[PDB]
Amino acid sequence: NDPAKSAAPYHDEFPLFRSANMASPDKLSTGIGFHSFRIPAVVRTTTGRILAFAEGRRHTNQDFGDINLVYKRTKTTANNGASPSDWEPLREVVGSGAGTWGNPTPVVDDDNTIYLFLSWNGATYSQNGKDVLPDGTVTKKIDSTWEGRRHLYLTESRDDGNTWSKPVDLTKELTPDGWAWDAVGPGNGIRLTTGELVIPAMGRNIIGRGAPGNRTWSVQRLSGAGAEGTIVQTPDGKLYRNDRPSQKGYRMVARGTLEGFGAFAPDAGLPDPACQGSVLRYNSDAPARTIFLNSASGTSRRAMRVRISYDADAKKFNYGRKLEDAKVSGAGHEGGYSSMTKTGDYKIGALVESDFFNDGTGKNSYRAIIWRRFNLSWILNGPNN
Ligand SMILES: O=C(O)[C@]1(F)O[C@@H]([C@H](O)[C@H](O)CO)[C@H](O)[C@@H](O)[C@H]1F
Ligand SMILES: O=C(O)[C@]1(F)O[C@@H]([C@H](O)[C@H](O)CO)[C@H](O)[C@@H](O)[C@H]1F
Ligand SMILES: *[C@]1(C(=O)O)O[C@@H]([C@H](O)[C@H](O)CO)[C@H](O)[C@@H](O)[C@H]1F
Ligand SMILES: [Cl-]
Ligand code: NA
């Protein structure tokens, strides 16, 4: 079988975004703190530096209200984020206004420009409407007006994540007209063997063409796609969308190319409780591997499972390994949204939400984000394969 199984298994895990209830909570240099951190995204840059993004949810764990896009980088290009002291303090990409800056969806381009697509909504709008903000204000439902719709923003870094451009609004260009709710990712985009960028979004892929870091963007509309999509290029070189379902059950999968996709259909091999997931191209040479991470349950977010597919079209994934085999203590109950990258030292790097659950499903439940490193051997030597 997989020759990587013969390596010494390795795993390494600790909280990277520490909620307000924890010792040494993560705050900006300006003193700004956050109740909860949610919605992770992680990329390794061409230098080997690792950039980890999240939504800094200022006041509660809710998806609406004042939410800033925060991040951490590894201190050097070479440390691979192996220990807590390897990581810089919390920084901010964008936090302007009392609205929502979220859905981090980064992609590293060939020139090392890091593109970060984001969603935005106004301070007084929420997905469902009639939600109560900290000051008692009742939100309006997100609608199709300019003020009340979800926007699509793009920021980039030319200095290995050190600084970020003021986000530009690309809603009119890259979001279909008449839309209200929208989402990009969250998680990551990809660079294809043939050179294009592909960013998964609600109902569509965003395609980047042309010179690295100077791309032209267009929209590839997808029939039957989900709101929260993932994208990978499979070993056969084709495209693969693996999306969160609208109802609990299974991941929704479609395959295609830049010239078009086939139908979405449930993947019976990948149970999902209606939650975001992540997918990663690990390598293309024998055995070629695609990695997948989600909560492997039709009902629960607390069943995080990392898996490998050796299939040229990622038809079938193995059982993989439960993340709870390498449990983190003192950071709540692991499970929820995730993001993965390959590290510079031949590991998979994963960000995974965790929930203290101190207020149950309520707004005051503190949310933190765990950073994991593990090798293929660790996945393959799991007891349930
Ligand atoms: O055994 C595996 O690794 C697996 F679970 O089943 C494999 C396949 O069905 C045979 O077990 C090996 O040829 C798939 O190719 C793999 O992607 C995976 F799903
Ligand atoms: O959905 C779940 O699995 C859960 F039961 O509820 C989640 C959350 O409170 C609800 O999904 C509502 O947002 C927790 O993060 C999970 O740890 C778990 F408790
Ligand atoms: C997420 C969740 O925790 O379930 O849900 C999305 C969104 O509500 C769903 O995809 C349905 O459209 C939020 O945007 C995200 O912030 C998070 F809460
Ligand atoms: Cl969504
Ligand atoms: Na803000």
UniProtKB/Swiss-Prot annotation:
Enzyme Commission no: 3.2.1.18
Any matching Pfam family: BNR_2
Keywords of this entry: Carbohydrate metabolism, Glycoprotein, Glycosidase, Hydrolase, Signal
GO cellular component: cytoplasm; intracellular membrane-bounded organelle; membrane
SUPFAM superfamilies: Sialidases (SSF50939)
Catalytically driven reaction(s): Hydrolysis of alpha-(2->3)-, alpha-(2->6)-, alpha-(2->8)- glycosidic linkages of terminal sialic acid residues in oligosaccharides, glycoproteins, glycolipids, colominic acid and synthetic substrates
Family designation: Belongs to the glycosyl hydrolase 33 family.
Function as written in the Swiss-Prot or TrEMBL entry: Sialidase is able to release sialic acid from a wide variety of natural substrates including bovine salivary mucin, colominic acid, bovine fetuin, a serum glycoprotein containing both alpha-2-6 and alpha-2-3-linkages in a ratio of about 3:2, and glycoproteins and glycolipids from thermally denatured human lung epithelial cells. Does not show any trans-sialidase activity since it is able to remove terminal sialic acid residues but is unable to catalyze their transfer to the acceptor substrate.
Protein name per UniProt: Exo-alpha-sialidase
Organism name: Aspergillus fumigatus (strain ATCC MYA-4609 / CBS 101355 / FGSC A1100 / Af293)
Upper taxonomic lineage: Eukaryota, Fungi, Dikarya, Ascomycota, Pezizomycotina
